[PDB]
Structure formats: C-alpha cells, structure tokens
C-alpha cells in the first residue's frame with residue numbers, strides 16, 4: 298500500500314531522530330562506532346552480534362526496521378553486548394556498563410514520551426501481514 302509505505306517512511310524519520318539524539322550525547326560516544334579490532338582483538342570472538350549507533354542508522358536507511366520493537370531489540374543489543382563484554386568490577390568496566398544502561402534507558406524514555414502507541418500498533422500489523 299502507498300499508505301503503508303508512508304507509514305514506514307514516518308517510522309524511519311522517527312527512528313533517525315531518536316538515534317541522532319542518542320548519537321550526539323557525549324556519554325554514548327563509545328557506542329557510535331564499531332570497536333577497534335586492533336585495540337580489542339577478542340571482541341569479535343566474545344561478541345557474536347556487534348551493534349552500534351552507526352549500524353543502526355545504516356539499518357534504518359536499508360528499511361530493516363518495520364517496527365519500533367525491532368529497533369529497540371538493536372538498542373537492547375548495544376546494551377547487552379556492553380554488559381557481557383565488560384563485566385568486571387574495575388572502574389573502566391563499571392563506567393561503560395553505566396553508560397550502556399543509560400543509553401538503553403534514554404532510548405526507552407524518549408520512545409515512551411514520543412511514540413504514539415497506535416502508530417506502533419499499525420506498524421506491527423502491517424509487518425505481521427507480510
């Protein structure tokens with residue numbers, strides 16, 4: 298449907314806007330790009346599904362997200378990866394875990410305030426019909 302395509306285009310605009318606001322926050326810099334393999338060579342072995350905000354933008358533009366739920370699974374992945382890969386009591390690990398939790402919480406709070414539930418419901422229904 299042309300009307301369904303308008304729905305998804307609006308979803309994409311909304312997701313780019315949320316992702317931009319996360320990406321510009323200084324606390325979340327570490328999550329804006331894939332990690333440096335030369336810097337952290339065991340990362341690809343420990344973390345099988347790397348995710349970051351640049352990859353999220355790429356996925357939005359590739360029409361990979363048809364719902365906000367599918368977007369949040371990738372935000373959740375950014376966060377869970379950070380908790381799994383940096384689990385220690387040392388301050389560097391604690392800092393990154395705090396920042397990961399904050400990224401997750403911030404994304405969910407923006408969505409809570411700014412996503413219309415009926416718009417998400419529409420997206421989910423279109424997705425489930427395909």
Ligand SMILES: Cc1cn([C@@H]2O[C@H](CO)[C@@H](O)[C@H]2O)c(=O)[nH]c1=O
Nearest residue numbers: 327331332333336337378379382383
């Ligand atoms: C996302 C992430 C990053 N880092 C460090 O910050 C650099 C830039 O991402 C990485 O190369 C790594 O040294 C980590 O140590 N753990 C992580 O989970």
